[PDB]
Amino acid sequence: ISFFPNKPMYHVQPHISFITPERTMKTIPAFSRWAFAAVAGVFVFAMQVPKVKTTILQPIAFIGDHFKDKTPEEDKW
Amino acid sequence: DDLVHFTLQNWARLTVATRAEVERAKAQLRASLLLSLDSTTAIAEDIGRQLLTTGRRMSPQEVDLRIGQITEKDVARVASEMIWDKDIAVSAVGSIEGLLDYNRIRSSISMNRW
Amino acid sequence: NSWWTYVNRWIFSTNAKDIAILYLLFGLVSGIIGSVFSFIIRMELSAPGSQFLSGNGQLYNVAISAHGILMIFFFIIPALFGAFGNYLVPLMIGAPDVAYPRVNNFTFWLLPPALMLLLISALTEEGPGGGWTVYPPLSSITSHSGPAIDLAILSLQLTGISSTLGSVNLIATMINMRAPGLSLYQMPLFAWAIMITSILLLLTLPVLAGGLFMLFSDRNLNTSFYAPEGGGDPVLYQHLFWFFGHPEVYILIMPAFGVVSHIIPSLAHKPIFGKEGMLWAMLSIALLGLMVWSHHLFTVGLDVDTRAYFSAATMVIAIPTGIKIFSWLATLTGGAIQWSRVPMLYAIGFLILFTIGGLTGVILSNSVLDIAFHDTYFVVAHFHYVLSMGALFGLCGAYYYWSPKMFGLMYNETLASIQFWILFIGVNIVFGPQHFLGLNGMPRRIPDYPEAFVGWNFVSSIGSVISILSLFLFMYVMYDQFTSNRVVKTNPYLIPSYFDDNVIFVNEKLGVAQSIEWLLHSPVHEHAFNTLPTKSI
Amino acid sequence: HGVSLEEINTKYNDFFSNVQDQFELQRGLNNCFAYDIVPSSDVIEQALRAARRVNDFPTAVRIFEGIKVKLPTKEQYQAYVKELKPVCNELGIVLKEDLF
Amino acid sequence: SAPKPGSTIPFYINKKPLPTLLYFGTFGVIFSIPFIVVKYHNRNL
Amino acid sequence: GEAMIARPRLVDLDKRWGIMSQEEKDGLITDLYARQKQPWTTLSIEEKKAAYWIAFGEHGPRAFSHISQKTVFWGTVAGLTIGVVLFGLIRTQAAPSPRTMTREWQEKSNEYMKENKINPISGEASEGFKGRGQISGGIFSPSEK
Ligand code: HEA
């Protein structure tokens, strides 16, 4: 009934090879941080695409001033 | 180089140590601290050293209580405080040509995939 | 089968201890709903113009009226006036139970149906629209058609009569069940205050009962009680309402006075300065807070002599309160202070907020001065900065101070202190800008405002948001305290003096306290005071 | 009002002239250190004799610790220790700052 | 009857894994009631 | 109590005291009580240290909890920033602002009420008036889209 009869405080747990639940519970913050870093990098590399500027960047206050078009009435033909 | 790299990797892994390994180490240490004393000379030497370095000799009850309190979180904290990326001291004698430089040896004390 | 035992211990039980906990829980479930209502109304006025809504002014009136009524009559009165009295007054008087257990059991259960019927009334096609102070012509069948405000009138009626019925047994309990050798003069200050509030409430509320019933009869029996064409004068309604409204806030805030006067000494390890003078000044306040009622009718247009008579006497209220604050200041100095304790933190933060609110109250007690601030945001700032800074702080301090006695658990000091700081900052930056908004000459109860006011509303909205996180942290800390199994000794607030040995104090000094409640085990027995404690006659 | 400044000094010296119980000694010693009245040389000396009589060591060093805490400046404490050194050396009293 | 209280008067059993969701759901619904209240007045509009 | 108590019995007392069982505690207290009967001159320094630590120590009754004030400060800062961020995030989902919230209309009104001497004392029609007046500035008065 028990893996170690002399010490019942030892239970085996479901696993595949070493993907036991405790290891994943320890791992989760690393995945969260890596995903956040990847998202930040992707956002950094696409901060000048016109669609991104006109959808996300400008509605943000304070910083929204910088990411505009300042050309007066003298503009595209 | 492979041996040193794997040794330092197993050193650095101690920040995510599991409960079972800690329990096994606790049992082994508790057994080993008592299996050594098997002669009058050994007991006298142990008593003398304990009195000279600390000031008193710890009774087995106190040792057992001190060891039992240790858990895996304490091990993780201590490892992250002293075993994680930190200065090390090396000493080599013999045909040590295969040993790499200091920086490559030190680079294995921390794992980058965390 | 513990189900019968379950419902006999909770529903068919008349013990005082098993009821005050339900008082606290009912107060909490009312307060959460009220705080969310306040959050939604403050988020409406973040920026000018219709916002998150289709310009529904009647909906905004319903929201403000519901917030006011439910947070003034379902949050603070039932969870402070009788919640911390019925549990604690028998402990300090020297009695095992209240005088009439059955009426004590009955009073609590009149409130849940009141809450349900108030919610149903607010869930009508129109809902109450007269605000916290509903007025006859607006309430007239001409404006509202339906069972919207009649149920609110009924809720106010039944809640008032229940509170009156919940205060008859208390006075008898603390006037006849006194300990042998406990003169009424030698009574502790907290029970003194609670008895003063009980007598004032019982003396005044019947007037509300009669006036509210006769005003409500206008909608059904078509009486001419207040009809302008029927010979009724609504100024009579205002006089009747403000013969009650003015002392209501004092009877709500006196338990805060008592709890502060109890928190200060024990955590300061110093007896309270001038007990007799303080209690006699508080009695003077209690007697004084009845003959002044027309300060709420300054711009209605009454006569000069009446205005002078009822405006000159508004100032004399300040003197005893200033004496009380000075006495507490004197008590604080000299003696030891543990400023890191959460009850001490709340007690210290109470004083400055209460005194600045009192200064704001003495600002607008003149007919020459009220004309520039009557029914503007300045009175909102005054009454909010007094109510939510005094009564709420007193309730929080009382909870954090007597919680181990109610249950027998320990909370987290770090989270409690963080919650206190966050709440203090939020409530300080919420009612701050409103002072300027009312000083500019802009009225209250307006979902829309002229454009030159946006900045201060924007500054208030962030603090309103912060208060919600404060509430969340309080909920988390309450849950943690309830399920942390942290034991508590008999008198956790007793420490050895500067010359008490660590072996002498532990064995020949335990079981001593400034008050009775700390002598018993933190989870108190069902049948305490088997024999009456006898003092020096 | 009640007792004046010096009267309580004389009264507490008289009380500490004869104390045989540790609890009473600590009680009177607590009640003395609350009138803003730093004990005179006779009062502290008699308290030390009483502590010697009732056979309690840590009370003696607690006396000097409390006097150092209560006194306003370092000069008064230095004068007190200078005028009371022989007693402490006679009764084998070790100060806190030199104890560890 | 002379029972000794266990310093536990919570009106309902509490423990870590299961009851947390029930407590949080009750808190959420009693927090979000005003929402349905404000939605009801603007249903047919 | 006449023989001197061994030093290895009264060394590093503070660390050992918690783990040490009750019986050793009573034995040490009784031994020190019997010891203090003798004149205090004959006693060693470690005996005095142990006696004082036993009496006016930190263990037992006067063992208070310590609260990390830095934790409170950081928690307050985190709560404030979370509130600000959440309010900003739920801010954008509001109804569109009135058309009069534009810089152009604000300045037009500013030059308008000056003509009709509306507050010329120290307000909208002051002699110098470098200040704004009827402009909130910042996000409240953005440029025309
Ligand atoms: C919560 C409790 C509470 C308390 C304690 C007070 C305290 C006071 N209140 Fe207030 N008040 C309310 C609750 C309270 N009020 C509410 C809810 C309303 C609105 C009603 C509604 O519309 O529904 C209201 C409204 C209100 C008005 C109506 C204004 C308007 O709408 O037109 C007036 C006017 O006189 C007033 C006066 C006072 C006065 C003089 C005090 C005095 O007690 C204050 C005295 C305290 C001090 C002054 C500070 C301490 C004193 C000293 C330091 C001494 C030295 C001071 C000086 C010499 C300056 N109150």
Ligand code: HEA
């Ligand atoms: C009981 C008194 C009381 C309390 C506590 C409050 C609390 C608050 N009130 Fe209210 N209010 C009134 C009494 C009160 N109010 C009255 C009488 C009116 C007039 C009604 C009318 O005009 O008809 C009114 C109206 C009113 C308006 C009028 C709308 C308008 O004129 O435009 C506004 C708007 O700003 C407002 C805001 C607030 C805010 C932001 C809070 C609070 O958010 C401030 C911070 C407080 C908290 C966030 C709650 C903290 C709670 C706890 C931590 C839980 C503790 C629980 C226990 C342990 C049991 N109130």
Ligand SMILES: CCCCCCCCCCCCCCCC(=O)OC[C@H](COP(=O)(O)OCCN)OC(=O)CCCCCCCCCCCCCCC
């Ligand atoms: C607010 C103004 C309204 C009028 C005031 C009266 C309110 C209702 C009457 C309540 C009794 C008052 C105290 C009596 C003395 C006393 O205490 O009677 C004693 C008992 C309690 O004490 P005991 O048996 O434990 O004593 C121990 C004996 N040795 O009372 C009762 O069991 C009350 C009976 C239950 C009635 C509650 C329902 C109330 C209905 C209200 C609706 C009717 C009025 C509607 C008005 C529009």
Ligand SMILES: CCCCCCCCCCCCCCCC(=O)OC[C@H](COP(=O)(O)OCCN)OC(=O)CCCCCCCCCCCCCCC
């Ligand atoms: C609007 C503001 C205007 C302020 C105007 C007020 C001016 C007069 C007030 C000063 C009188 C008290 C001073 C003590 C004199 C004395 O020496 O009293 C004698 C006693 C000495 O102790 P004893 O009795 O045991 O002596 C025994 C003799 N055998 O002192 C005390 O116990 C002081 C203890 C209580 C006083 C604490 C004061 C706390 C603040 C007071 C108000 C602060 C005002 C803040 C706003 C300015």
Ligand SMILES: [Ca+2]
């Ligand atoms: Ca709005």
Ligand SMILES: [Mg+2]
């Ligand atoms: Mg008005």
